[PDB]
Amino acid sequence: TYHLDVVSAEQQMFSGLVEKIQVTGSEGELGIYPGHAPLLTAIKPGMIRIVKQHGHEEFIYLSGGILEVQPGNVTVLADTAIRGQDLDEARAMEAKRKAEEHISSSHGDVDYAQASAELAKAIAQLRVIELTKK
Amino acid sequence: NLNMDLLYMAAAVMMGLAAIGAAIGIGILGGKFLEGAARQPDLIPLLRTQFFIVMGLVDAIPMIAVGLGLYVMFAVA
Amino acid sequence: NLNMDLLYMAAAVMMGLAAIGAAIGIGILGGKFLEGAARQPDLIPLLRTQFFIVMGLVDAIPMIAVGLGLYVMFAVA
Amino acid sequence: NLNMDLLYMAAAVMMGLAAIGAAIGIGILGGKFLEGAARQPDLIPLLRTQFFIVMGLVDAIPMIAVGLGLYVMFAV
Amino acid sequence: NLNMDLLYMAAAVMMGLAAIGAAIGIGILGGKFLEGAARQPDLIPLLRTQFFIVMGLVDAIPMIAVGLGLYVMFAVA
Amino acid sequence: NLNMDLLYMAAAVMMGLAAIGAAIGIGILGGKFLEGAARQPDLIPLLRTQFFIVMGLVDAIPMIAVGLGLYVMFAVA
Amino acid sequence: NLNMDLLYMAAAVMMGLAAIGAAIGIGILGGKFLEGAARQPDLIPLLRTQFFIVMGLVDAIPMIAVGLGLYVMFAVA
Amino acid sequence: NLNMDLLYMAAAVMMGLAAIGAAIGIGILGGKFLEGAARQPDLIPLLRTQFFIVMGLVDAIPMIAVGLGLYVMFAVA
Amino acid sequence: NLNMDLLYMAAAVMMGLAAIGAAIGIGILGGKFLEGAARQPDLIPLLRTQFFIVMGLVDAIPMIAVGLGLYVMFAVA
Amino acid sequence: NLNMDLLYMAAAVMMGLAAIGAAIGIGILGGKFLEGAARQPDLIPLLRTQFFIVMGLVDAIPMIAVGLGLYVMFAVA
Amino acid sequence: NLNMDLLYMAAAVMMGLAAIGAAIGIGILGGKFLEGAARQPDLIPLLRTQFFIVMGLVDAIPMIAVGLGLYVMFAVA
Amino acid sequence: ENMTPQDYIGHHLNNLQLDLRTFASLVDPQNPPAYWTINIDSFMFSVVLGLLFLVLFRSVAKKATSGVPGKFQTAIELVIGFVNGSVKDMYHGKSKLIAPLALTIFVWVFLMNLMDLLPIDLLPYIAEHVLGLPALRVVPSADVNVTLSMALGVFILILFYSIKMKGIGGFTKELTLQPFNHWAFIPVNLILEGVSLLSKPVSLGLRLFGNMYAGELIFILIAGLLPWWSQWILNVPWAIFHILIITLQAFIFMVLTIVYLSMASE
Amino acid sequence: MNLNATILGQAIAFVLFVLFAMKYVWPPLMAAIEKRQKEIADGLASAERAHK
Amino acid sequence: MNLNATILGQAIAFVLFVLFAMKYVWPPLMAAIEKRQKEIADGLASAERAHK
């Protein structure tokens, strides 16, 4: 079918043959399928699904990066990304606790520019941890 | 005879204009529905619920016109 | 008889214009609502609220037209 | 006499306006169907199913107009 | 004589066109309002004020036409 | 007499509206086909088959209009 | 009959077409106002002053029609 | 006599509506053809082939309208 | 008497069509003006100069139409 | 002999609808031509060739409309 | 009475439709011109030289309609 | 028995008008020009439904407990929270009037709309034969009286906050100076302000009126035109659709009232 | 046209409407009640454990 | 249509229902929500003070 690769900018996250995927994007989550388009750009905090031969999936956290999409062998360049069983529901719940504190502890636009990213990273973890249970 | 040949024109204009209005309104709305269903197929049922809600809004006034058209057709002649 | 006859057509034209105006306006507005719902699935309960906000104002004037058309056909006839 | 040619005129009005309605409605709807299918050629059957559904809605009012126009041309 | 129903026809055409104009203008304007609100959902209280501002300009002539139509419908006719 | 003078007018209006509707509908559909093809030409024959599939339903109603216009012009006369 | 009712009809035409023109023109202009205000939320004072500048010219030519229709209904007829 | 007045008017309505339809349809189709040609030159001949194929169907009904308008003008009246 | 009483209607048609044309043309033109002002805000005093360059060409025909309408009402009729 | 005065009206409708069609079609076509020139300024003498190839098809029907209307206005009337 | 009156009516419809045509066509064309100016400002003296060429064609056909309108009013009387 | 579709529609489009100049019942073919001719039926329905709103809300408000609420108390606190959230979205002042105003508008309009779901001939039949009254109709919110009465109260309330702090300060300053601080645009922008300001409440009235008036009309048309074996299949879908219509119209009348007053004060 | 017939037709229409409403509107009604109940209960139980 | 003295009677009725809701219905409602919120927030405070 097609080949996919993922890196966390200080770690390799995935490399191998794959059938289909589902990923986040420049504005929000998006249903991806093979053979549709030729161009590429950035990633908002989210996650990715990797369905391989015989129909076996895996679920990876994507904290931020860029996505190629166009090529047969595609790859995801992520400034930070964590494997689906390196992370856990407890870790995402800690992220929830952090983000819900920081929402109460952020009061200006300049600091909310960071608080919103922290919340987005937490929410991305909270969606990947639920998708991990499949 | 003289009286009736204008009443069907009145009904005709009512229903024609209402039909074009409703058709193109639902056209715009459902075109956005299919555009949205192209990004995330998983949300196709949720967006289908939203689509029928807003579509219920779209046809409101045209339905009034259509009802009076039926009234003229079967009571005023 | 023309006094009776012509107000059927007058009410007909009012209601046809009301139908087209309302239908197309709601079509455009709800289409933008649907695409917005498509990109951010989490904000549907918010965009729906603002959608009804704006829809009230969009349908303000078509309701004027359609109500007065009903008035013309049934009250003065 | 003067009656029947005006009935033909009224039938012309309904059925031409219905022509406009149905034609432009399906034009807009199928325009989004084709751009979405060009973006998603693997999902053509799914979007085509949706296209039948919303086709039913888009021509709901237009087919009411068209049927009643048939009653004005042929049923009187 | 026919002056009553001719005056109602004049007012009817004017008010129906007013309904067209107001409905579609507010439709376009509110569609852009919602497209802006989906993108920056924390700016709803600000965009929703600018919407007051320009919506007030949109309806001016249509509302004048509606008032004058009511004048012809009820004062003149 | 007056019959033929009005019947040519009736056929004219019906076929004129049919022409406008059919032409502009296919215009809208074909534009998106061409743009999508320019992005990726591998889909051109496929999308052109889809194009005929949809264009048939576009021409459904306007040829009812054209058939009845030709009937009025050459058979009712 | 023919003196007054035609003047009310002429004023109806003038001010109805003025309603269409003013409402839809300001709708198109204000849509871009709000899009710009969504892209540059620090520029709203600047863009709304530019919007006032353009708005004056958009409204100017319909206002002749509105005032002249008021002239026709209240001074001539 | 009474014939030619209305027969010329019928032909005029026919060809005027045809002139609207063909012009607008080819406008949309050619606009997308040109933005495709700007997007990918060196595919101009292929896209022009598709362009003529679609244009043939766009001009179908309007040319029937033009032919029968010429028939009414130069054969019936 | 009907001769000048319909000249008021003629001027109504003329300058109302001029009104809608001018309004919508300036609307589209100013919409592109504002989007340009949003993309390059340091560039407004140049693009506004171009806007006034081409707005005169837009209004060149509608202004003479409106002038002839005013002439028809006040001089002729 | 009343025959003349309808013939001027019949020429007027043809040339007015032809003006609308042949102006808006070339507007839509040349707008895309100008954006294509904005992206690729070194290709302008090629896109001019394509633009004059397509504009002659846009002006196929409208110039016949003008020709026959200008015929009706002078030769027949 | 009603020959000289209907001549003015014919000129009204002619020049009104011509005004719509010219205004809308140049509105679209100049909007695309301004977008091209916004994207590459130091390229304006070339795009404007292309604009006037295209604008000449756009108004060429409305302007003979306008000329015949003034001919109908002043020369034919 | 001279029943026809148009005669049936005529019976159903008539209120129970009582002329207070002689305190006599006005039969349908007998309509005077006088002002003091209060309509009994829809007015009675209106005040009865408003009293129903107040009675249910008082029978819970006199007892409401802070534990886990009962299954009836929970519905009333849900509508209370819905109104409170809608007001709190659109208002920042401290006046307590806005909230009960909105609550009464919402529930009263809702109940009056809800009357439109009933079979068109049930209560009018019982009025004609059991009691003897000449006519009856069941939807109060389908009246200009109800809708514009509520709208006119809202208009008074608009000028209330516009004339408090705004009235001594803003209203004067805004009308004279803003937007461009010119002598010639005071009259012009006053004209714009006048028509806009007066259309704000009247539009509330006519919006809600049009929806209920036409829904009652649709039920009447189905009952009058079609034979009994075919009425059902077209009557049911309209009722299903009209549930949505009535909910939205109650909501919108409430919402636009809140927005008007909020802009009047803030 | 018979008015008894119109009453009969209205009766059939009303019955069908009422059955439709009972089988599509009332089954999901109590969702908000459940939401408030569960939220309140979990919060209070966690607070109890916090005190101990 | 039938603009009637009913409109003025119903204006008085509108303000009377507003007054009845203003005096009796609305004032007694505010306290419960705040009490229930307070008894959940204090538990979070207690957990924080335990950890501290």
Residue numbers in the entry:
A (entry chain H): 3 to 136
B (entry chain S), C (entry chain N), E (entry chain O), F (entry chain M), G (entry chain P), H (entry chain J), ...: 3 to 79
D (entry chain R): 3 to 78
L (entry chain a): 4 to 269
M (entry chain Y), N (entry chain X): 1 to 52
Direct quotes from the study:
A key component in the generation of cellular energy is the F1Fo ATP synthase, a biological rotary motor that converts proton motive force (pmf) to adenosine tri-phosphate (ATP) in both oxidative phosphorylation and photophosphorylation. The enzyme is based on two rotary motors, termed F1 and Fo, that are coupled together by two stalks: a central rotor stalk and a peripheral stator stalk. The central stalk is comprised of subunits ε and γ and rotates during the enzyme’s catalytic cycle. E. coli and other related bacteria exploit an internal subunit, termed ε, that can sense the environment and inhibit the enzyme under certain conditions.
Here we present cryo-EM data showing E. coli F1Fo ATP synthase in different rotational and inhibited sub-states, observed following incubation with 10 mM MgATP. Masked 3D classification focusing on the central rotor highlighted sub-states in which the εCTD adopted either a condensed down conformation or an extended half-up conformation. The maps generated for each of these sub-states showed the position of the εCTD, with local resolution estimates of 4–5 Å. However, due to the likely high flexibility of this sample, it was still difficult to unequivocally assign the position of the membrane domain subunits (a, b, and c subunits) in the maps. To obtain clearer information in this region, a refinement that focused on the Fo motor was performed and produced maps of sufficient detail to enable fitting of the membrane region. When the εCTD is in the down conformation, the central stalk is no longer stabilized by the εCTH1:γ interaction, likely increasing its torsional freedom, and the εNTD rotates relative to the γ subunit. When the εCTD subunit is in the down conformation, εCTH1 can no longer bridge between the εNTD and the γ subunit, thereby enabling the complex to open up to an unclamped conformation and allow a greater degree of flexible coupling between the F1 and Fo motors. When εCTH1 is in the down state, the central stalk is no longer clamped and has increased flexibility.
